[PDB]
Design a protein around this ligand. Structure first.
Ligand code: SF4
Ligand code: ZN
Ligand code: ZN
Lengths: 98, 752, 131, 38
């Protein structure tokens, strides 16, 4: 929750760790809660979909999310989304029923 | 206002006008009258789109030729902005002229952005959307339904409803933005995608992206409808070379070839099934092929080829099929052994760079495939797929890449290069061979445009130097100049920081990305600027990987904690939708006074059209020069090609490529002359790059700001921000930065 | 079962030096070790369950492509093109005639590969090479 | 282990031979603490 990169070395707590999977479900639920159509003025999705048949050289590894030797994600992208998600939720909470 | 040029009456949609706009408008008119190409660079703080539309639209409405206007942008977002500006002018003209003159203006985009079908518009990729729309609009469903009403094949109500009305009555006279177009079409159950495409020939001004003009896959259909004497405008063309290069590029992977074999086997199985039951279709296609007809003759206007043409229309052979790939089974065997040859070439152990001619010779040796049949591979595959009743083409999708490779490599031999690398990612446990077909000459894709059209206007906010672009792209210009904004009081403070508060040099070089001293200095700079920045602060990083690494280090070091106190942190992400959501949240925070900081990539999706005017953008933090990845096979080959052909030094182009992106981000913070912000370039290497910046940015950069420190820069930022908040004296800007109608007449009289 | 000799079952893991060869006559994969022990003395029946075609050791060659079917197409194509060879100028620029000729040689390869009519095709190849 | 490497088989062991083992003012008798390094 704080944004720290989880370290497998850290033992943690057995009881609290049971909610790690539950927290993952809330993250997906929160993403849908925040997902809504965006104005075409600042709609970045349309820009990449302007030409759906663009065929070109793939970008270098510097322009892609980092990966490790095994090839799976290093996990640094998750914390970026987490902080992004936190800001979105905080702003959304302002526009409440009141 | 309504002022006069030598003979052209132009109606400006504002009561006031900047001196730069009038000079910009005057130069554009001269270019159109004299004919030819021009490169005009104007500051981002002055209205450019409104000035372009005002003069160009007035030009056609007055002169007898009534030349149409072609507006080219780099992204779909800019299309909406231009259309909104386009709507502004026509509304003002209608009010002033007392009537709505006959005028049609539409934007053109993909199906994904204009699909109203409840079931086909819920996809995450445009390729799937196109396939589903084609299935319901190819005409197979309509013909099957007519023969047998019991057929379960469905149709699209939006597409069908268009047949009832005529093309001229699809939309009322006027300008229809994407937001307005969707609303109008939804109320009447019509397809905006088909409305615009069938209506291009009737539009006075048509707006689309560069891909619709440079990429042959989608350019040929649109280019055939537009006129030949129309005015062509290239807006924000400071990165047009990249668009041209990617139009004729391809990448092949082991997975793609593996999937291609599965598709080839499926096609062979399908041909056998069709042969057993319905062999007349094969004979009918074969008979037409023997005659000499091509996809254009056989395919109806309602349907489209399965494989989009990968080469320019002028490079397509006009002769008949060679014969080796005339029959379905023979073509499949021809296609199959080609895939096998590609697979064996991917088992190399070192990077191999070879020209297309050498690749063809080796192919002609190991196998017996000639050059000419390859050029027809894409054309032949589309015909075969069309006649095979392939309603579901999920398996055959992989074969499109193979067909594209064959046609591209067998067509061009100069300006193209093939790279085979055993390691797509050097940091991988197992090799992942990748084959890249690259275009080195950027003028090949834009050559047809500069010849088909007589007058072309190239305009942008940070297109400098203006001499390189004619060098890089083979064209000549009648005039090329850059304007300097005549602002009474300085509104933008460009500064360069070469060291931190500790006086230690700071740079964003990749090899020292994980440096405690450099990372801390940048983090302290980020925190310090967030303390004083009132509303919005945008930070651009050289690459996404650098941003990911440095941000993680900041989190561990606790730097992000201090930033969280004063501003919300929004970070660009690979997912386009998430990044769009971040922008909405970032704008909301700035508007409500909470304050937000946006971390993005200088070469990312945010920098390619998203602007931070007024409160949204008040401070631009350029963390290092956005240099490309030097140790890249694609870049090194292109650098060598330019050096040998255009005599452009490798270092010079690398500096030019990086500076244009840095300036691009700098110019996205000013909209009018009342907008202000601070632009800080944080790297020791920006110190000597002052001459490389745009003229209007270099002018504002003082000598004392060439090399500053974090503490010194912060002090200037605080002083500058305080000064800009004071009420401006009107008399200091009555007729030196903004002109009324009377002031403009004075300028005309004095000049004459 | 994709990296071992079907006969001796010499797995690559325990025998990293194992090298596999193929024979044009039946296009079967056999390791080099089996080739020497069974064919060094002279020609012998192919050591496969359901293959009774005789072959010689000298005819063995390394496989180029990883697909056996394409190998048969290419080698048959090479044999055919060794006899049926012509260029555009041979017909004095008659592209229509050249296109027909290309189909005829292409069709000949198709029939030979799938054995639609082996006797007539092979006899047809035999007569042309003398010309 | 050497023999397996000759045959191309990875040996999961090593040769054991390769393992390497691995003055004034004396009226302040004990007040002075040795702060030799910082
Ligand atoms: S016709 Fe238009 S609305 Fe219907 S599926 Fe195609 S793009 Fe979508
Ligand atoms: Zn064996
Ligand atoms: Zn055999």
């Amino acid at each position: 929750l704080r944004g720290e990169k989880i370290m497998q070395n850290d033992r943690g707590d057995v009881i609290i760790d049971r909610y790690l999977t539950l927290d993952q479900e809330f993250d997906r639920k929160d993403d849908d809660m925040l997902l809504h159509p965006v104005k075409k003025i600042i709609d970045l999705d349309g820009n990449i979909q302007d030409d759906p048949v663009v065929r070109g050289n793939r970008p270098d590894f510097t322009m892609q999310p980092g990966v490790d030797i095994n090839g799976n994600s290093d996990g640094t992208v998750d914390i970026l989304k987490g902080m992004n998600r936190l800001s979105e939720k905080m702003i959304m909470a302002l526009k409440n029923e009141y | 206002m309504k002022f006069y040029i030598d003979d052209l009456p132009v109606l400006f949609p504002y009561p006031k006008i900047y001196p730069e706009q009038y000079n910009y408008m005057c130069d554009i008119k001269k270019t159109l009258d004299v004919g030819g190409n021009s490169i005009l660079e104007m500051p981002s703080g002055t209205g450019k789109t409104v000035s372009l539309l005002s003069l160009t639209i007035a030009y056609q409405m007055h002169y007898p030729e009534h030349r149409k206007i072609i507006y080219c942008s780099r992204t779909m977002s800019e299309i909406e902005k231009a259309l909104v500006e386009l709507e502004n002018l026509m509304d003002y003209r209608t009010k002033e002229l007392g009537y709505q003159e006959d005028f049609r203006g539409l934007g053109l985009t993909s199906r994904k952005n204009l699909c109203l079908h409840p079931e086909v518009s819920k996809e995450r990729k445009g390729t799937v959307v196109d396939e589903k729309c084609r299935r319901m609009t190819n005409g197979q469903a309509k013909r099957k339904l007519e023969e047998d009403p019991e057929a379960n094949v469905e149709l699209c109500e939006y597409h069908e409803n268009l047949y009832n009305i005529e093309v001229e009555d699809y939309l009322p006279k006027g300008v229809f933005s994407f937001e307005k177009l969707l609303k109008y079409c939804e109320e009447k159950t019509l397809c905006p995608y088909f409305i615009v495409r069938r209506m291009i020939s009737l539009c006075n001004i048509i707006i689309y992206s560069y891909h619709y003009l440079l990429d042959p896959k989608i350019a040929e259909r649109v280019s055939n409808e537009v006129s030949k004497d129309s005015i062509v405008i290239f807006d924000e063309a400071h990165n047009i070379d990249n668009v041209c290069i990617e139009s004729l590029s391809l990448d092949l992977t082991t997975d793609a070839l593996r999937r291609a074999t599965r598709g080839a086997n499926a096609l062979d199985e399908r041909i056998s099934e069709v042969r057993k039951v319905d062999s007349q279709k094969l004979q009918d296609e074969y008979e037409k092929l023997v005659q000499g007809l091509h996809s254009a003759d056989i395919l109806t206007d309602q349907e489209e080829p399965f494989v989009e043409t990968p080469v320019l229309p002028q490079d397509l052979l006009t002769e008949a099929i060679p014969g080796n790939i005339r029959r379905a089974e023979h073509f499949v065997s021809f296609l199959k052994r080609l895939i096998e040859y590609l697979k064996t070439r991917m088992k190399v152990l070192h990077v191999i760079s070879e020209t297309p001619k050498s690749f063809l010779q080796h192919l002609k040796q190991l196998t017996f495939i000639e050059r000419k049949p390859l050029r027809f591979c894409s054309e032949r595959l589309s015909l075969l797929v069309r006649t095979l009743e392939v309603t579901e083409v999920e398996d055959f999708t992989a074969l499109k890449d193979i067909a594209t490779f064959a046609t591209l490599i067998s067509t061009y031999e100069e300006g193209f290069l093939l790279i085979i690398e055993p390691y797509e990612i050097e940091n991988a446990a197992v090799p992942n061979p990748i084959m890249r077909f690259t275009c080195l000459d950027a003028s090949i894709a834009i050559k047809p445009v500069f010849e088909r059209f007589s007058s072309v206007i190239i305009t942008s906010g940070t297109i400098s130097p203006l001499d390189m672009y004619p060098r890089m792209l083979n064209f000549k210009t009648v005039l090329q100049k850059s304007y300097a904004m005549t602002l009474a009081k300085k509104s933008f403070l460009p500064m360069i920081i070469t060291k931190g508060s500790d006086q230690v040099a700071i740079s964003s070089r990749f090899e020292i990305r994980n440096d405690p001293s450099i990372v801390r200095n940048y983090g302290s700079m980020l925190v310090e600027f967030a303390k004083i920045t009132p509303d919005g602060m945008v930070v651009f990083f050289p690459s996404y990987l650098y941003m990911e690494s440095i941000v993680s280090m900041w989190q561990t070091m606790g730097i992000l904690d201090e930033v969280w106190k004063h501003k919300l942190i929004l970070v660009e992400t690979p997912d386009a939708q998430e990044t769009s959501l971040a922008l909405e949240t970032y704008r909301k925070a700035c508007s409500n006074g909470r304050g937000a900081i946006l971390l993005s990539v200088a070469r990312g999706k945010v920098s390619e059209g998203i602007d931070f005017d007024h409160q949204y953008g008040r401070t631009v933090l350029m963390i290092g020069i956005p240099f490309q990845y030097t140790e890249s096979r694609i870049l090194k080959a292109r650098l060598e090609f330019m050096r040998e052909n255009y005599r452009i030094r490798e270092n010079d182009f690398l500096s030019f490529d990086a500076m244009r992106h840095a300036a691009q981000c700098l110019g996205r913070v000013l909209r009018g002359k009342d907008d202000y912000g601070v632009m800080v370039l944080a790297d020791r290497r920006f110190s000597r790059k002052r001459s490389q910046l745009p003229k209007w940015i270099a002018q504002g950069l003082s000598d004392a700001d060439l090399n500053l420190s974090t503490d010194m820069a912060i002090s200037n930022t605080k002083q500058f921000l305080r000064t800009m908040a004071q009420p401006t004296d009107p008399k200091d800007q009555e007729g030196v930065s903004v002109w009324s109608y009377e002031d403009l007449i004075k300028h005309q009289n004095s000049r004459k | 079962n994709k990296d071992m000799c079907p006969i001796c079952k010499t797995d690559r893991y325990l025998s990293p030096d194992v090298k596999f060869l193929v024979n044009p006559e039946c296009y079967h994969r056999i390791c080099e070790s089996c080739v020497d022990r069974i064919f060094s003395l002279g020609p012998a029946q192919c050591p496969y369950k359901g293959c009774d075609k005789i072959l010689r050791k000298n005819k063995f060659k390394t496989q180029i492509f990883d697909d056996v079917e394409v190998e048969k197409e290419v080698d048959i194509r090479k044999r055919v093109f060794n006899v049926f060879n012509k260029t555009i100028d041979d017909f004095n620029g008659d592209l229509v005639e050249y296109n027909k000729y290309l189909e005829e040689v292409e069709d000949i390869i198709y029939k030979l590969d799938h054995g639609i009519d082996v006797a007539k095709t092979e006899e047809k190849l035999r007569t042309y090479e003398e010309l | 282990p050497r023999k397996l490497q000759d045959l191309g088989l990875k040996p999961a062991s090593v040769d054991p031979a390769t393992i390497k083992r691995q003055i004034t003012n004396t009226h302040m008798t004990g007040i002075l603490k040795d702060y030799s390094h910082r």
